[PDB]
């Protein structure tokens, strides 16, 4: 639902089996928190994988320079 940094998903989809199943799939992503910002001190954003992998190449600031303003 969150994964703040990056969008998320929670988008539906039909899960077929052997030929077809008109069922439905959905809930995905992950979660975690407590990210120590070198600045003042850590707020616990609820990002997930890909979201957490993002704060890597990026910063920890820029990655928050958005969740903040905007």
């Amino acid at each position: 639902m969150k994964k703040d940094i990056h969008p998320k998903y929670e988008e539906i989809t039909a899960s077929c089996s052997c030929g077809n199943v008109m069922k439905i799939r959905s809930t995905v992503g992950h979660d975690l928190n407590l990210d120590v910002c070198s600045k003042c001190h850590p707020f616990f954003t609820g990002k997930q994988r890909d979201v957490a992998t993002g704060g890597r190449v990026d910063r920890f600031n820029k990655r928050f320079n958005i969740p903040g303003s905007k």
């Binding site: 407590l34 120590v36 070198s38 850590p42 190449v57």
Partner: protein
Amino acid sequence: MQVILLDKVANLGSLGDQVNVKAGYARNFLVPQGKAVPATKKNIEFFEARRAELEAKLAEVLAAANARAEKINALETVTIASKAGDEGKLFGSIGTRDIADAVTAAGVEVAKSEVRLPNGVLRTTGEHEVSFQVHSEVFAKVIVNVVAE
């Protein structure tokens, strides 16, 4: 798998490993409160003004303490007698002071911490060899001559 500790901590790296390091280990320990590291361009080169300015001594700093043997060689004949007497011996003491202090002719000054003479100087008077032992990177030469009085 890229960080810059510089403050080695049991890790297979010191001064900040610039080559493949551990990953996921710093996300919540090393980097936070411990030793920030992000070995990503910006941070990387930033270590230069912290390390690349320590080896420049072999040219800049050395030049300010390497010309020893050059600055002092044609030195004025050090005529610091050591009390020549005793039917052919002396009384004066030849060791550290008289040797190093044998330069303040005009007024210059030094220290008795740069000498190269394993054996204690015999109480003679002949051409006293004083190979100035400033730094390991550079040596020098000085002389001393005892006189009667």
